Amino acid sequence: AQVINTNSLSLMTQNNLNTSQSALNTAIQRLSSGLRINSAKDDAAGQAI
Amino acid sequence: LSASRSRIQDADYATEVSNMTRAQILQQAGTSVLAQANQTTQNVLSLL
Amino acid sequence: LSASRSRIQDADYATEVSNMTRAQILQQAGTSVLAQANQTTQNVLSLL
């Protein structure tokens, strides 16, 4: 139905861009840094060893 | 949740546009008919 | 700290573009409907 009050396709697309941005962020981070484990977030056990 | 609210709440256009046009035509028809019915009793005067 | 302040303070663009668009369309619709509703009372004069 043609409703102009709310547009629920732009909502989907907006909610969908974020999951791409996240991967972009991690990829750019790793390349410049020079290594893989930049925090304890990546995995806890490897950092300790 | 926003999508479900929109379904319960919003208004569709084509429906109301059609209803509006339909309402206007009956207005004009009623006004014309009222004038026509109103001029009826003039004809009695001719009788005298 | 700078990242945190940015999170609290700065403004997205997709949301605002969407809101601006949906605002303008309503404005145009409202003006047209206003003209339509103004033209309403003409019929009464024809009754006379």
Place this chain on the structure above:
Amino acid sequence: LSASRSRIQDADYATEVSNMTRAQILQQAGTSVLAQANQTTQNVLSLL
């Protein structure tokens, strides 16, 4: 294994772009024809 999952799960682009185009033009045609249909019944008012 990666190749096989890709074969199952991914989406192709030529097909979707073509579907999008063919869906938009139909929507425009439908809207114009609906307007044409709505404005049809005025001629009845002429006959009074």
